[PDB]
Each structure stands twice: as C-alpha cells, then as structure tokens.
C-alpha cells in the first residue's frame, strides 16, 4: 500500500514573429515651399528607400 503526493510548478515564455510584416515604419516629415506662389491642399508622394 503506497500513497503518493505530488506538487508541480512550471513557467513558460514564448516569442513569435511573422517574416512578411515583421515591423512597421513611421516617418516624421515636414514640407517646404521655395517658390513664388502658395500651394493649397499639398499632397506629396514619397519614396522610402533602404539599401
């Protein structure tokens, strides 16, 4: 006749990533005007070049 008593304890940590959308970019920008006329509703189109 035997009687066992047990007491466990565990702690896990994980870290996942998606290799297609693994980060987000945020660019702080500012517009400049060096002409003779003002421009209303300024809508620039920019490139983001890396290497």
């Amino acid at each position: 006749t035997a009687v066992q008593d047990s007491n466990g304890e565990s702690w896990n940590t994980g870290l996942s990533i998606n290799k297609g959308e693994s980060a987000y970019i945020n660019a702080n920008v500012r517009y400049y005007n060096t002409g003779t006329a003002p421009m209303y509703k300024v809508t620039p189109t920019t490139n983001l070049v890396l290497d």
């Binding site: 998606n18 290799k19 297609g20 959308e21």
Partner: protein
C-alpha cells in the same frame, strides 16, 4: 476634316501652336499626331516570405 491626324487637337490648334506647350514641336504639324507612347520597366523585385 477638322482633326486630320486623328488627335484631340484641330488643324488650326496644332498649326498655330495654340495647344499645350509641353507638346513637341514635331506635333505642331497637322499631319503628325500628338501621341504619348508610355511604357514601364522593372528595376528589381523583392519577395517577402510570410512564414
């Protein structure tokens, strides 16, 4: 015909230059059409494997 070359501008508009000033001086002839020939070329191609 008022538009001999078949383009959006009439014989008088082409011959007098009374059109867009970015149009080549070739196309000021009523026989040469004002016509853009636009193409696209690929520089490189990036693949984002989403695993």
């Amino acid at each position: 015909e008022s538009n001999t070359a078949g383009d959006p501008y009439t014989d008088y508009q082409k011959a007098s230059g009374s059109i867009d000033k970015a149009i080549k001086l070739e196309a000021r002839d009523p026989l040469v059409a004002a016509y853009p020939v636009v193409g696209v070329g690929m520089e490189n191609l990036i693949i984002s494997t989403n695993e």
